[PDB]
Design a protein around this ligand. Structure first.
Ligand SMILES: *[C@@H]1O[C@H](CO)[C@@H](O[C@@H]2O[C@H](CO)[C@@H](O[C@@H]3O[C@H](CO[C@H]4O[C@H](CO)[C@@H](O)[C@H](O)[C@@H]4O)[C@@H](O)[C@H](O[C@H]4O[C@H](CO)[C@@H](O)[C@H](O)[C@@H]4O)[C@@H]3O)[C@H](O)[C@H]2NC(C)=O)[C@H](O)[C@H]1NC(C)=O
Ligand SMILES: *[C@@H]1O[C@H](CO)[C@@H](O[C@@H]2O[C@H](CO)[C@@H](O[C@@H]3O[C@H](CO[C@H]4O[C@H](CO)[C@@H](O)[C@H](O)[C@@H]4O)[C@@H](O)[C@H](O[C@H]4O[C@H](CO)[C@@H](O)[C@H](O)[C@@H]4O)[C@@H]3O)[C@H](O)[C@H]2NC(C)=O)[C@H](O)[C@H]1NC(C)=O
Ligand SMILES: *[C@@H]1O[C@H](CO)[C@@H](O[C@@H]2O[C@H](CO)[C@@H](O[C@@H]3O[C@H](CO)[C@@H](O)[C@H](O[C@H]4O[C@H](CO)[C@@H](O)[C@H](O)[C@@H]4O)[C@@H]3O)[C@H](O)[C@H]2NC(C)=O)[C@H](O)[C@H]1NC(C)=O
Ligand SMILES: *[C@@H]1O[C@H](CO)[C@@H](O[C@@H]2O[C@H](CO)[C@@H](O[C@@H]3O[C@H](CO)[C@@H](O)[C@H](O[C@H]4O[C@H](CO)[C@@H](O)[C@H](O)[C@@H]4O)[C@@H]3O)[C@H](O)[C@H]2NC(C)=O)[C@H](O)[C@H]1NC(C)=O
Ligand SMILES: *[C@@H]1O[C@H](CO)[C@@H](O[C@@H]2O[C@H](CO)[C@@H](O)[C@H](O)[C@H]2NC(C)=O)[C@H](O)[C@H]1NC(C)=O
Ligand SMILES: *[C@@H]1O[C@H](CO)[C@@H](O[C@@H]2O[C@H](CO)[C@@H](O)[C@H](O)[C@H]2NC(C)=O)[C@H](O)[C@H]1NC(C)=O
Ligand SMILES: *[C@@H]1O[C@H](CO)[C@@H](O[C@@H]2O[C@H](CO)[C@@H](O)[C@H](O)[C@H]2NC(C)=O)[C@H](O)[C@H]1NC(C)=O
Ligand code: NAG
Ligand code: NAG
Ligand code: NAG
Ligand code: NAG
Ligand code: NAG
Lengths: 568, 568
């Protein structure tokens, strides 16, 4: 009677700000067990030395003081152990956020002809996390650039694209890069932009300068595609899917340069086309969108308890767009490559088992405990039935299923005589006893013996035999016209000790007699101790058919059928 | 805009205690209507005078002062009238509870031989409500007789039956009758009972003296059956069904002399047998239990509004164990004999209609209002579609459904020319227009005119015709082995204004492309403006079959199929 280690908290991927006020980085790991568990940690698939005046432990959590990329960056995972086995936590990656300021060198001036679009390169500084948000400031820091059809800011390159340049756009433009992971924002030095005036602005055809390449995205994620063009007449951008309908969860946005898809499905895979139009010309661009899916469990493993010597199959099934591979760990070490199947299970197999399902994109863990039971045969839970009722000429099966672990051997003895396999007497291996073509000499006391490696068990039962239930008078077929009265006769013989009932069925279907419609034309008039007749009034065409009377008792049932024809 | 009278509160059967403290009896009747209703009352199928001083009116409720059996007891019902018709309330019976005290005459003494059962007659006084409860007192009023297997108290006759008489039974016995309806209790004069002692008492066989006759009871009601026998050895009573199982909601009780059935079903109909046993002999008694069911609505009528000249069918359906008869009243007077059906409805038919469903046991009312509408044809709610899309050689139907009462006449005009019934052009009577084998000359502006007895209406619409979508290159049948790559080709021609899609189906079922299983072997590949091919990888036996490519657009769809054979 114990409790294996179960993971409550597992470490997650973490990024530590380089300039954080706190000098400590903590990874969380916590587990439950009946004997208090022991926690261990591993770094880059290698053991981590304890003490050293750097690492510290806080109830299973690993704390590092003044971490340096040259020392701590990498993969950590946690191990929870006890007297019943070990369990491994999900691998967690620890990295450090990096973001330097822009170079303080002055930016050169840029002159642009009015009516000609231009591109401004942000050239962001060095950074470790690539989840950067880009904006642009005008003249002063508090000022920001509004998103229009002429002005576009790429979220990948970080550049600023102006389709049409006018005198109103003149001024100093600076880039602004923010990282939310490290919460650090920096702006570049301002670039003066001067538009040379023109009296006869020249039109330019639409040219797509911001394109979106082939993108692999996961199911359920939010995906954004960018497409932008330049030209003297403000170009219009339209999105469409190739010979297919656009996904329902699609937002073109007001600007028309960004396409957002929420909770992408497997159907959305294919080509997407962005078309830019103006008065002078037009352009088209096609891109590939591939859809993938993280591994998701179908039948995850649960704490299981099995008997000794019994073959065991654990169903571990996961589904993903790329067929995921299945792995099996035992106490934190590789054990199986998929479809774990055990034979002649013993105490050695018991422990903690972990099924991993991993594709090329993600991996999911499932933890469980396998316990082994060793028990002597006992009939306390499912004892033998005191009285069993049987009839002559009918096969009878007596169940003797005890609670035993190693699947013990079964024997049957008729009180003072031992039974063996015979023609009409059969002992199948599940423990029950079969008797065919029964006679009154068969009734008596039967004892079921179960012999096991650990102990033996004996159970007693009594079987009594009664006369079979048969039908003396069967119903006679009849033919009548519409609107006449019909009578169906049924009389049965049974054992007085047993209770007999009569059930009428029409064309293979039992009549319920609980609906008002059936009572109109059908009535049951059971009389005497064995007479069970049926009356039909105001017969109709649909009433004609097969009527079967069944005498039913607790041991067997006997049926006799007849036909009723209705003419007009 | 009017509103007919609708009943909120209806009078119920009432019993008034003869010696009540309050001297007024009130019957409640309430209805709502847009013109405030007028209330009338009827007594014993006859009008009741409003000015009698005894009677008074309180907001539609009828109050009676100092009611007397000879004058006021009987059947009352309420009538709610207005400018739109009359409605009748459910008939309510008003009766007066009656219970006089016992006669003060002394009761003679009764001597009984020990070992012989006896019967004590209550002789209850006159009473109007028959829901009497019987008990018995010994010597003093607070003392009561407990019900045992020897002592039984009938709830119908009210007598006390003693199966075995002993010396302890001597004493004075008085009957006690209570009525819950009037909450009145009275006890009779005491009867002295003296048992003559006997030595070596001889046993007597069991004789059933309390029997239960054939009983008709309604579905869902509570049924009680009484059976009791007498004899020197205290007899045991058992209840059973002849050739069927006893109802689940059956309680035999501790005494064994009363059988209780709760929420009786239609199945409980049949014979019930009571068996009394002792040492000397036994006895059996059979009785018939018949089950009935009150009328219950299936599709009761509701306030309905219909147009003029339209045939009307009123569905009024009720179900009961005895087939209920259906009657139709109009404004409180007989109108129809069942299944009311009206043709060429006019203003005269509008009013208040009452469907009654009554069997031999109960009756159910259903009140409703039938309104008739006369309206000029209008296209405000369902105007003509501004733009209609069609294809060459394809049949097209243009819907012109106005809101008009007498089903007006319809005409169609191509702007300046009137259309008539033709070979390819047919104008059916519902108002829509059908065109077959359409050509480019057919496209244009069509006007639907609706001429009615009351006014006319004109609606305008524009129908544009486009080229049909067909398949230039059809898929080619292919035969391959398992594990091979197959390509199915499909190319279509369509009108550039319309948007075209491609749908692939396998063996008459469209492929969803939303399940991970389909993506394993199927890859849909679309290119250009008309190329839509499909790729099958790692073919299996189950993949072989019929593949159909369907080019689908807003106007029509064109399909082409092919076959794929798999070997190996
Ligand atoms: C034939 O006999 C049966 C059985 O006696 C009657 O049916 C019972 O009627 C009583 C009331 O007359 C019901 O009791 C009520 O139960 C309500 C809750 O119903 C649920 O819970 C009960 C008990 O577990 C279930 O049986 C039932 O199916 C439901 O699941 C309570 O809310 C009621 O309380 C209110 O009314 C009582 C009335 O005395 C007040 O005292 C309370 O203060 C409160 O206002 C009430 O207790 C009972 O549930 C019904 N069924 C059964 C099986 O007992 C038939 O009415 C009766 N028919 C005829 C024609 O005689
Ligand atoms: C221009 O051309 C159009 C198209 O042919 C005509 O529209 C037809 O109008 C006639 C009436 O003049 C319609 O005939 C009637 O149709 C009724 C509805 O039929 C449907 O429902 C029945 C129900 O059983 C179906 O069996 C049937 O297949 C339909 O689905 C019928 O109920 C009518 O039956 C009888 O009614 C009277 C009653 O006395 C008899 O006198 C009749 O002779 C008839 O036996 C009747 O058949 C016809 O249905 C309309 N066409 C279509 C396609 O529905 C226009 O009338 C014609 N002229 C003008 C000016 O528009
Ligand atoms: C956008 O970038 C442009 C870059 O060209 C920038 O233009 C410069 O602005 C400064 C600030 O106004 C200018 O410097 C001034 O020039 C005027 C005209 O010559 C002088 O009168 C000013 O003198 C005052 O300030 C001096 C500061 O030392 C004092 O010493 C003096 O006593 C006066 O108080 C001042 O020198 C500069 O000429 C322009 N142009 C260039 C090429 O630098 C612009 O300001 C930026 N911001 C915008 C446009 O919002
Ligand atoms: C007395 O008679 C009974 C009644 O037959 C007998 O019980 C039988 O035992 C045999 C031996 O195991 C059972 O046969 C097996 O049953 C299991 C469960 O269904 C099957 O999985 C087995 O299939 C394998 O074995 C076959 C060869 O037996 C192979 O050909 C097959 O390809 C499989 O590899 C096998 O069929 C049999 O089912 C029972 N009978 C039952 C359950 O009704 C008993 O052994 C006899 N002797 C005694 C009691 O001393
Ligand atoms: C993708 O965006 C949707 C936006 O709806 C996210 O769904 C939730 O939307 C509600 C809107 O009120 C937000 O309050 C929630 O915070 C959103 N998230 C969740 C988990 O509920 C969705 O989560 C986004 N998915 C990703 C992967 O970013
Ligand atoms: C078929 O039997 C039924 C049931 O008896 C007959 O219906 C009624 O039966 C009662 C029996 O007491 C008679 O009093 C009625 O006169 C019978 N008729 C009706 C209409 O209720 C039924 O009549 C019998 N069949 C025929 C063809 O008469
Ligand atoms: C059928 O075509 C598919 C698609 O071209 C082939 O898939 C290849 O799969 C392997 C393993 O994932 C990739 O490395 C290859 O790149 C895929 N092919 C191409 C062209 O990229 C598949 O092998 C083909 N099978 C047969 C029997 O021809
Ligand atoms: C394990 O328990 C979960 C609890 O919801 C259940 O969904 C799952 O089916 C169980 N495992 C198996 C193999 O049934
Ligand atoms: C059956 O087992 C019980 C133990 O529970 C034992 O007392 C009894 O003697 C056994 N019967 C035999 C061996 O016949
Ligand atoms: C019954 O009444 C009689 C008549 O007065 C009396 O003699 C006798 O004692 C009474 N019995 C009991 C038990 O009080
Ligand atoms: C009639 O109205 C009642 C409610 O008043 C509703 O329960 C019933 O379903 C309605 N039946 C029809 C046919 O509209
Ligand atoms: C349609 O009817 C309206 C009034 O009902 C009228 O003003 C209009 O001129 C009519 N149009 C045609 C085309 O008859």
């Amino acid at each position: 009677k114990g409790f294996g280690p179960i993971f409550e908290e597992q470490p997650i991927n973490t990024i530590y700000p380089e300039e954080s006020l706190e000098g400590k980085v903590s990874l969380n790991c916590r587990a439950r067990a009946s004997p208090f568990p022991v926690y261990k940690w591993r770094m880059n698939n290698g053991d981590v030395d304890l003490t050293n005046d750097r690492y510290s432990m806080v109830g299973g959590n690993l704390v590092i003081n003044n971490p340096d990329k040259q020392k701590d960056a990498g993969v950590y995972y946690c191990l929870a152990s006890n007297n019943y086995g070990m369990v491994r936590s999900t691998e967690a990656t620890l990295s450090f956020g990096y973001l330097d300021p822009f170079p303080p060198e002055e930016r050169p001036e840029v002159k642009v002809k009015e009516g000609k679009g231009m591109v401004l390169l942000c050239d962001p500084p060095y950074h470790f996390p690539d989840d950067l948000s880009y904006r642009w400031l005008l003249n002063e820091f508090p000022v920001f650039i509004t998103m229009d059809k002429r002005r576009f800011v790429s979220q990948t390159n970080g550049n600023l694209y102006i389709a049409n340049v006018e005198s109103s756009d003149r001024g100093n433009y600076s880039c602004f890069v923010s990282s939310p992971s490290i919460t650090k924002s920096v702006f570049s030095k301002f670039i003066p932009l001067i538009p040379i005036p023109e009296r006869t602005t020249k039109p330019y055809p639409a040219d797509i300068v911001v394109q979106f390449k082939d993108i692999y995205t996961m199911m359920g994620q939010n995906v954004t595609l960018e497409c932008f063009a330049l030209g003297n007449p403000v170009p219009d951008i339209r999105w469409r899917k190739v010979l297919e309908p656009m996904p329902s969860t699609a937002e073109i946005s007001t600007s028309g340069a960004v396409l957002k898809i929420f909770n992408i499905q497997l159907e959305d895979e294919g080509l997407y086309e962005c078309e830019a139009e103006n008065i002078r010309g037009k352009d088209k661009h096609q891109a590939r969108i591939y859809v993938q899916a993280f591994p998701e469990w179908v039948e995850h493993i649960n704490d299981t308890e099995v008997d000794i010597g019994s073959d065991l199959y654990w169903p571990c099934i996961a589904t993903g767009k790329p067929i995921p591979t299945i792995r099996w760990l035992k106490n934190g070490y590789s054990y199986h490559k998929g479809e774990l199947r055990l034979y002649d299970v013993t105490f050695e197999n018991a422990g903690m088992y972990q099924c991993i399902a991993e594709n090329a994109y993600g991996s999911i863990y499932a933890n469980a405990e396998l316990k082994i039971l060793a028990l002597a045969p006992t009939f306390e839970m499912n004892p033998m039935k005191k009285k069993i009722l049987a009839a002559k000429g009918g096969r009878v099966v007596i169940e003797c299923k005890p609670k035993a672990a190693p699947k013990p051997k079964f024997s049957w003895s008729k009180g003072t005589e031992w039974l063996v396999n015979s023609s009409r007497i059969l002992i199948w291996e599940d423990g029950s006893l079969e008797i065919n073509n029964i006679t009154r000499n068969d009734g008596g006391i039967y004892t079921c013996f179960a012999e096991n490696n650990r102990g033996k068990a004996n159970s007693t039962g009594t079987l009594v035999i009664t006369n079979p239930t048969r039908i003396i008078l069967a119903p006679i077929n009849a033919d009548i016209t519409v609107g006449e009265n019909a009578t169906m006769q049924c009389a049965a013989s049974f054992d007085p000790a047993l209770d007999l009932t009569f059930v009428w069925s029409f064309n293979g279907y039992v009549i319920d007699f609980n609906k008002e419609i059936t009572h109109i034309h059908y009535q049951r008039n059971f009389m005497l101790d064995a007479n069970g007749e049926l009356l039909i009034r105001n017969a109709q065409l649909k009433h004609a058919g097969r009527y079967t009377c069944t005498a039913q008792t607790i041991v067997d049932n006997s049926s006799a059928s007849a036909d009723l024809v209705v003419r007009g």
